[PDB]
Design an enzyme around this catalytic site. Structure first.
Site: not given
Ligand SMILES: COC(=O)[C@H](Cc1cccc(C(=N)N)c1)NC(=O)CNS(=O)(=O)c1ccc(C)cc1
Ligand SMILES: [Ca+2]
Length: 223
Positions: A40, A52, A84, A175, A177-178
């Site tokens: 993603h 870094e 993913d 942020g 992610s990955g």
């Molecule tokens: C996107 O904004 C966010 O604050 C988190 C990010 C994130 C990413 C990876 C892992 C975590 C974690 N908790 N360990 C969090 N995700 C969300 O809050 C997404 N939940 S959600 O229920 O808001 C959602 C689900 C699907 C879509 C298309 C959009 C939004």
């Molecule tokens: Ca740096």
């Protein structure tokens, strides 16, 4: 990372930052020319930043290398986030040293209860937003699939595992992610998804790397 601690400069040598004019995802260096991240996080014009700590200040141990090829898993499903995972090949091999090193792939899958290290430059607040400039670390255990399902109502596949705390307060976030989930010195997971961050009964969900070792090795061998 919410509820974590400052890792310390270069103490997580395999952590990489994916940059497209700004940091947008984490990743893990698995060899001198390949990085693994989340599917993603796919995007064109990616520059991989190694060595870094503070991503807004050149500190002296960085290596900036552009990606030459990105390979998203053939079965990635953006709706469910199943599979993913993505591989990124660097235009040139990185120079490995004590601050820039690869992380080994697992030979076996980690069991629930295992303590792991999660790291990233993601949001540090469960409510609101605050992005750190230095790398943050979090110690978190792998949760059993049964306990995760019963408490969160998430639908996870055999290619995912939950990690964190059902009580909330500590978790990966936007942020991160990955990024890597390392247990017993091996890369067992990739930061994938979750409902919000550090919310009660809403732990993080991670890509189960041990299920992809064969694909990773075969792909790297012919690309
Ligand atoms: C996107 O904004 C966010 O604050 C988190 C990010 C994130 C990413 C990876 C892992 C975590 C974690 N908790 N360990 C969090 N995700 C969300 O809050 C997404 N939940 S959600 O229920 O808001 C959602 C689900 C699907 C879509 C298309 C959009 C939004
Ligand atoms: Ca740096």
């Amino acid at each position: 990372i919410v509820g974590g601690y400052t890792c310390g400069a270069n103490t997580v040598p395999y952590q990489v930052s994916l940059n497209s004019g700004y940091h947008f995802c984490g990743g893990s260096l698995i060899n001198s020319q390949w990085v693994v991240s989340a599917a993603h996080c796919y995007k064109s014009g990616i520059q991989v930043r190694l060595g870094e700590d503070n991503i807004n200040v050149v500190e002296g141990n960085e290596q900036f290398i552009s990606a030459s090829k990105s390979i998203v898993h053939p079965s990635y499903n953006s709706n469910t986030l199943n599979n993913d995972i993505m591989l990124i090949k660097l235009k040139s091999a990185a120079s490995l040293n004590s601050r820039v090193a690869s992380i080994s792939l697992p030979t076996s899958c980690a069991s629930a209860g295992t303590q792991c290290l999660i790291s990233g430059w993601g949001n540090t607040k469960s409510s609101g937003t605050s992005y750190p400039d230095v790398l943050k670390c979090l110690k978190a255990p792998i949760l059993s699939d049964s306990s995760c399902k019963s408490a969160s109502s998430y639908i996870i596949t055999s290619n995912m595992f939950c990690a964190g705390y059902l009580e909330g307060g500590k978790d990966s976030c936007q942020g991160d992610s990955g990024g890597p989930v390392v247990c017993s010195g091996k890369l067992q997971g990739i930061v994938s998804w979750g409902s919000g961050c550090a919310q009660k009964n809403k732990p993080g969900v991670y890509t189960k790397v041990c299920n992809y070792v064969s694909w990773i090795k075969q792909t790297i061998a012919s690309n």
